[PDB]
Design an enzyme around this catalytic site. Structure first.
Site, short mmCIF file in Angstrom:
data_model
loop_
_atom_site.label_atom_id
_atom_site.label_comp_id
_atom_site.label_asym_id
_atom_site.label_seq_id
_atom_site.Cartn_x
_atom_site.Cartn_y
_atom_site.Cartn_z
N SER A 138 -58.97 -36.73 3.89
CA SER A 138 -57.85 -36.06 3.22
C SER A 138 -56.69 -37.04 3.20
O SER A 138 -56.09 -37.32 4.24
CB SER A 138 -57.47 -34.76 3.93
OG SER A 138 -56.64 -33.96 3.11
N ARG A 139 -56.38 -37.57 2.01
CA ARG A 139 -55.33 -38.57 1.89
C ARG A 139 -53.93 -38.00 2.06
O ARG A 139 -53.02 -38.73 2.47
CB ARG A 139 -55.42 -39.29 0.55
CG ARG A 139 -56.32 -40.51 0.56
CD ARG A 139 -56.39 -41.15 -0.81
NE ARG A 139 -56.96 -42.49 -0.76
CZ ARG A 139 -58.26 -42.75 -0.75
NH1 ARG A 139 -59.14 -41.75 -0.80
NH2 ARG A 139 -58.69 -44.00 -0.70
N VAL A 140 -53.73 -36.72 1.75
CA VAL A 140 -52.47 -36.07 2.09
C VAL A 140 -52.40 -35.85 3.60
O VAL A 140 -51.35 -36.06 4.22
CB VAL A 140 -52.32 -34.76 1.31
CG1 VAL A 140 -50.93 -34.20 1.48
CG2 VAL A 140 -52.60 -35.01 -0.15
#
Ligand code: ATP
Ligand code: ATP
Ligand code: ADP
Ligand code: MG
Ligand code: MG
Ligand code: MG
Lengths: 539, 523, 478
Positions: free
Chosen positions: C344-346
């Site tokens: 999850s890049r966020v």
């Protein structure tokens, strides 16, 4: 009025019309041909030419041969007159028993049933196969995929599914042989002549199966459309008669294969690995017609041949989404001798849901899959360590899963003629308790091989009895068995005297029945006027 | 640009005629000045537009059929394959160097046909029907099409009669039927031609023993092989006498691509004569993966679009419509049979090739020949975990059916143990015992080449291994211990076992009696 | 326009001299079309339906308009097809307005940083691979591993959260069914009308029998219907189930239009196709309204092969990744989330702050359990530091299990992870599981759920009562 043949390349015929072109999917008759050649319009080429696919061989077609339009698609007989009959792709009787006296001939081409007339109920179709009914339970009114490569037991499984379900179903069944062997089609036809599913003569109307056959010797146009013929027979039995129909389709892969053999000649640049660009939409337009509507029901069983045991090949991978249940057959399971070679993990069904089949059946199926996955993870360290140090929690889950692997096997009624063991029908509550006992640990005292090729759990505890009696034999070897000649047996030379001697002709019978015609040494041609002349000696 | 004003131009709208009456009396004196440069026009004959690489594009030929034999003016034959709107694509049955632009092409009136009958029985033939053995033309023979449709459902019956091959690995584990298609598949030089040849030799040995109606007429189709191999096979079949029942169809590597494409259909049409006249046929399509290659070349030069490994799309139909002609007919059609043995060569054991997977999906059985079993001494190199047959029971010897089940099971016991042969713990003298019997069974199944065994001497030899009688010998001399068994057991056992078909309860008694009466040299 | 040639759902049309690229046309047979490639001699028209009713010489009328769908609040509760037309049999669409299917994605200044969480109700997703409002999260995996189950659990949990929030922070879901079976999407409307989730759900459905331009346009129709909610200050949840089937339908249209094929016969602009769609899932700034659109594309891999063309395209496009493995599915771990391969890049900036302090220990303990997971099937017990992680992680992977169609609120998953990462879990012998997993949420008093939901955090005035209530758990089954 009519059109003429403009171009023949393989199984694809270009027909040119002078005004009033036929529609796409219309049927065209070719007259002047020896056999009845039916062409179905695939596309409009553009300069008053249509491009067609042939339902028989195009050998013999002449550029300019008169092609007449039927004004309709391929129409086939449907109804009670087709019960106990074998049909073509174009609805001709190939069982050599009169014509097909069925009223209201229907087109093989229609659209899918729309969204509001879709049934949502889920009742379990009990088959009697304790790997099917336990782990991936079928749904009556649902679509079933029998995946698996060549030689893993798709046709034997669909034979056992016929012999279990279709005899005790009441409603009509339809078998669609799409691009398979003609020998096993004859085997199915014979085995339903004897078992009373198909009856002949005056009692023909008491038959419960309609055969539609599109086998491997047919051209790729006749294999691409024979599934639509079996499907429209089943759709008449579902919509108009209101019945609950069985539709067994042997190798729905050959539908996509037959559409792939013509798609380069239809002018389509190829897709991924070598299939047509229209693979998913052709398969969807075929398979969405096989549904359970509000009018009736079609329970479809479909064998899907995976090419070279590849489940990632796009022709079964497209098929996977259109199915309610899925019975993946594996070659490595059949290499263990286990039949039916159902992958106990890779098989999936929508009925495996605790809200549908019950929290006992669902939990024992999930427990069987859990212990089999645990054993599959232990199979690595067993071949490097040896299964001796696993501290009696992983050594027990190997033996329990091996008893489960042998207990998933089952003798088939249709497999008696190449195994010898009689077949077994194992009911649903009778296999849930039998797998729950070997899961919880009620049958660890039994031998491991005693679970192999039996029926109920009241057969493993009798094969244990027979195994421990048969190892209670092979104990003494003094004398008094068959080899001492004094009991009832003659000499070896007197048994020779009991042989009837056969004739030997040594002439082979090749001189009395042959019409030995004369063939010319020179070659014979036809000149400009069509007359038969010798070849002119001027090159 | 659309066709409506283009059809309006068919109505005359010239409104002046100051060129029409000028050039119409000037055209014919101009054309007559060049009438030696004009070639005569062509309608029902043909004329070569373009020729090259074995394809002639033929102008004219208005009333040719698809798949029809044509004949060029230089004598070489052809075949009208794709009939396009302005030309006909003709494949050349021979070398296309004798064809020029402007050569006349003659329609022969016939779809392509070969001579079938008893006159082919013994001849060496090309892929088109002409004899190449140098023994004159074909006599007592008739012409029949090479594109006969296979017999349907109502014409066939169930495969029951055995047709033994003489190879005891085959006849014990992968039992053939008399109308069954069985694929011999493997790598190069793994013994596929050896299995087909030993099958033909065993039909020669059985044809002088059965009464005139179980006799088997072999047809060997050599596609793409070189001519030295075909001549060596003719020398073998004549020096053993198998050429009296064998036809050989030979489209070699020097032949054209349509000749090698058409030679399995020629051999199947020659073999269908025996199937349709109540006799029993055996057809071997050696190198069917070379007929597919010839078909690929022939269709690529006709500019049809290529597919997987540049094969045609319809290369499945090519082998399916060929192999489905091997059937067992019903009693009202004579009861005759035809059993196919197609051969596919794989590349480095890759079974997942295109033609290999197609012909596996077509045929009934499989005979897999691995190149690692071949070099481990196991000859024939039968892959026993991969060689399948559809019939199983009801197509083999009833004596062999009682014995080979204990072979099929115990080889499977041997194979699931031998993947634990790095440690040697020898668990409870049971995993040691099952390999010490399975090694004996695999050493039993080996045999020589060009020496097929009768079925009674096979089911006696597996009787001496599925029972005891060989647990006292090492695994290094079972190929001589079974020679001691067949050579020293009295030959009246074989006559009773052949005449019964199974072991009578008086016969297994005498067989257990005489398998201790012999002195086997295994020490 | 005159039809020159028709076949395989492609009509080459002469004329239509002033037609736009992507414009709806109409045939004589009433079937619609779309002018897809405009050539110098003809127009290549993709046919919205069965082309067997089109003949050579048929008249093609242009409609003058690019392809548009009805958007608005009247699309809620309605089963539409890939063109916005209803298929549920509940009459015409009231209270809607037309808007184009292919709108340009909002730019840099239109964006805002993705900070508020979107709870899926799946505690593996909400704890380890968290979602923010405005995020594109790929649900990738093989067949029959539970991608649709995660999507439907997210929709059902949005219905469950929509009852306890005000009007502003309500999530309105759109499910796009690309190429699915038509009887499958009747089961989904049955389940949504049974659970109550159809009140907030639009369902676009281009089934397998639909034409390939309809399956190509169904994700854009669904994204326009969800962009209605994104553009007016509300929050959408768009789910493209089997985006790898929309890619196949676009491949079919591109190969039948004879556009030059690339890798796996996909056209050159299939990355542009999927990126045009997935970049419309944004978190808008407060000047535009502050609306958000959260996307969950679904890609079906073959044998875990994420090195395929479409799989690498959507992996390169989307923010995070939810990888579902086949061997974790049969091992009892359902939902079969691969914790090592799910990104999850966020990240942790858009999750529950009560979960943020407790799942941070959880992912480190699970990574330590993955490093030592070969030792688990050994008999000779190790140095008791690896036995501690091999028991702790093997109970933590049992805590992430979840049954189908029963999503959990975030304050209950927070206390369920606090009951297992703080050592309170079943450290007695583990034949007490069924009377031990949900005994925490069924025996701890429901006031602490109210406090944890209201503060959004495990405050220093709450963890004392949390450890107190977690110590006095009954487990009366033993
Ligand atoms: N049963 C056997 N015993 C001993 N040698 C054998 C046996 N079978 C085959 N061979 C040997 O293996 C070699 C290859 O045989 P064969 O020609 O049958 O294989 P092939 O696959 O047809 O070869 P190619 O692929 O070149 O046509 C031959 O030289 C032959 O001597
Ligand atoms: N958390 C879960 N617990 C129990 N069963 C589950 C869970 N998730 C999914 N399943 C089961 O797994 C099966 C497949 O689920 P799902 O359809 O969501 O996967 P999919 O990848 O979408 O399948 P397909 O690719 O065939 O559409 C369903 O029958 C469902 O009952
Ligand atoms: N239930 C079974 N019991 C025993 N043998 C089986 C069974 N199913 C298949 N086989 C074996 O597999 C062979 C081929 O199976 P088949 O049904 O033809 O599979 P496919 O149709 O996929 O080729 C059969 O000859 C048989 O020997
Ligand atoms: Mg089959
Ligand atoms: Mg060879
Ligand atoms: Mg799904």
């Amino acid at each position: 009025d009519a059109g003429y043949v403009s171009q023949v390349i393989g199984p694809v015929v270009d027909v040119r019309f002078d005004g009033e072109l036929p529609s796409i999917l219309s049927s065209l008759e070719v007259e002047g041909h020896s056999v009845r050649l039916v062409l179905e319009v695939a596309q409009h080429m553009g300069d008053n030419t249509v491009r067609c696919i042939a339902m028989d061989s195009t050998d013999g077609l002449v550029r300019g041969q008169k092609v007449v339009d039927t004004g309709s698609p391929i129409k086939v007989p449907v109804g009670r007159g087709t019960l106990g009959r074998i049909m073509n792709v174009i609805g001709e009787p190939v069982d050599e028993q009169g014509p097909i006296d069925a009223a209201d001939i229907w087109s093989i081409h229609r659209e899918a049933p729309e969204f509001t007339e879709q049934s949502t109920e889920q009742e379990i179709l009990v088959t009697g196969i304790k790997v099917v009914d336990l782990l991936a339970p079928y749904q009556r009114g649902g679509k079933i995929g029998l995946f698996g490569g060549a030689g893993v037991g798709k046709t034997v499984l669909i034979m056992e599914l016929i012999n279990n379900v279709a005899k005790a179903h009441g409603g009509f069944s339809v078998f669609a042989g799409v691009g398979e062997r003609t020998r096993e089609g004859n085997d199915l036809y014979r085995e339903m002549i004897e078992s009373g599913v198909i009856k002949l003569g005056a009692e023909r109307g008491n038959s419960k199966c309609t055969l539609v056959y599109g086998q491997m010797n047919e051209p790729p146009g006749a294999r691409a459309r024979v599934a639509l013929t079996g499907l429209t027979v089943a759709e008449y039995f579902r919509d108009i008669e209101g019945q609950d129909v069985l539709l067994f389709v042997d190798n729905i892969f050959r539908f996509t294969q037959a559409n792939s053999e013509v798609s380069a000649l239809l002018g389509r640049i190829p897709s991924a690995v070598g299939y047509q660009p229209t693979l998913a939409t052709d398969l969807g337009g075929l398979q969405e017609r096989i549904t359970t509507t509000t009018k009736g029901s079609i329970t479809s069983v479909q064998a899907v041949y995976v090419p070279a045991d590849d489940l990632t090949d796009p022709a079964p991978a497209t098929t996977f989404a259109h199915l309610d249940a899925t019975t993946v057959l594996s070659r490595s399971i059949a290499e263990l001798g286990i039949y039916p070679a159902v992958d106990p993990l890779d098989s999936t069904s929508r009925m495996l849901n605790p809200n549908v089949i019950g929290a006992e059946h669902y939990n024992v199926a999930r427990g069987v899959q859990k212990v089999l996955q645990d054993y599959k993870n232990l199979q690595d360290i067993i071949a490097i360590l040896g299964m001796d140090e696993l501290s009696e929690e992983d050594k027990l889950t190997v033996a329990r899963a091996r008893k489960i692997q042998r207990f998933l096997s089952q003798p088939f009624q249709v497999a008696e003629v190449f195994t010898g063991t009689p077949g077994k029908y194992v009911d649903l509550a009778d296999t849930i308790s039998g797998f729950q006992g070997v899961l919880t640990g009620k049958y660890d005292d039994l031998p491991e091989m005693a679970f192999y090729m039996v029926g109920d759990i009241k057969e493993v505890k009798e094969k244990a009895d027979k195994m421990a009696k048969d190892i209670a034999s092979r104990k003494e070897a003094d004398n008094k068995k068959v080899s001492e000649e004094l009991k009832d047996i003659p000499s070896l030379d007197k048994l020779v005297s009991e042989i009837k001697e056969v004739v030997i002709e040594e002439d082979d019978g090749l001189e009395e029945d042959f019409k030995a015609e004369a063939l010319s040494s020179e070659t014979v041609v036809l000149n400009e006027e069509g007359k038969s002349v010798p070849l002119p000696k001027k090159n | 640009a659309d066709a409506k004003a283009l059809d309006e131009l068919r109505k005359p709208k010239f409104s002046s005629k100051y060129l029409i009456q000028h050039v119409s009396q000037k055209l014919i004196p101009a054309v007559k000045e060049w009438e030696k440069s004009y070639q005569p026009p062509v309608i029902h004959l043909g004329r070569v537009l373009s020729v090259g690489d074995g394809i002639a594009r033929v102008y004219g030929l208005k009333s040719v059929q698809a798949g029809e034999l044509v004949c060029f003016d230089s004598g070489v034959k052809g075949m009208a394959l794709n009939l396009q709107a302005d030309h006909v694509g003709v494949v050349v049955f021979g070398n296309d160097s004798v064809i020029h632009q402007g050569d006349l092409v003659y329609r022969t009136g016939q779809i392509v046909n070969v001579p079938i009958g008893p006159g082919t029985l013994g001849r060496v033939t090309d892929g088109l029907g002409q004899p190449i053995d140098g023994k004159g033309p074909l006599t007592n023979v008739r012409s029949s099409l090479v594109e006969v449709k296979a017999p349907g459902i109502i014409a066939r019956q169930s495969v029951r009669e055995p047709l033994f091959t003489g190879v005891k690995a085959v006849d014990a584990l992968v039992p053939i039927g008399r109308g069954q298609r069985e694929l011999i598949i493997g790598d190069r030089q793994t013994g596929k031609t050896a299995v087909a040849i030993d099958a033909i030799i065993h039909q020669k040995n059985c044809n002088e023993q059965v009464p005139k109606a179980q006799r088997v007429y072999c047809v060997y189709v050599a596609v793409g092989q070189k001519r030295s191999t075909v001549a060596q096979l003719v020398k073998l079949f004549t020096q053993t006498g198998a050429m009296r029942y064998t036809i050989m169809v030979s489209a070699t590597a020097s032949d054209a691509a349509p000749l090698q494409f058409l030679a399995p259909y020629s051999g199947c049409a020659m073999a269908e004569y025996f199937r349709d006249t109540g006799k029993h046929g055996l057809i071997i399509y050696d190198d069917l993966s070379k007929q597919s290659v010839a078909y690929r070349q022939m269709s690529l030069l006709l500019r049809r679009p290529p597919g997987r490994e540049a094969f045609p799309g319809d290369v499945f139909y090519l082998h399916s419509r060929l192999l489905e002609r091997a059937a067992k007919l019903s009693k009202e059609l004579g009861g005759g049979s035809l059993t196919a043995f197609p051969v596919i060569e794989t590349q480095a054991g890759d079974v997942s090739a295109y033609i290999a997977t197609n012909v596996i999906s077509i045929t009934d059985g499989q005979i897999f020949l691995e190149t690692e079993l071949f070099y481990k001494g196991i000859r024939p190199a039968l892959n026993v975990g991969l060689s399948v047959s559809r019939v199983g029971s009801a197509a083999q010897f009833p004596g062999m059916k009682q014995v080979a089940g204990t072979l099929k099971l115990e080889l499977a016991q041997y194979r699931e143990v031998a993947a634990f042969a790095q440690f040697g713990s020898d668990l409870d003298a049971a995993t040691q015992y099952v390999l010490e019997r399975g090694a004996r069974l695999t050493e039993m199944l080996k045999q020589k080449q060009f020496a097929p065994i009768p079925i009674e001497r096979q089911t006696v030899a597996v009787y001496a291994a599925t029972k005891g009688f060989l647990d006292k010998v090492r695994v290094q001399d079972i190929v001589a211990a079974e020679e001691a068994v067949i050579s020293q057991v009295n030959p009246a056992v074989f006559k009773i076992l052949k005449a019964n078909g199974k072991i009578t309860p008086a016969l297994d008694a005498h067989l257990k009696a005489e398998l201790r009466k012999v002195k086997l040299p295994g020490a």
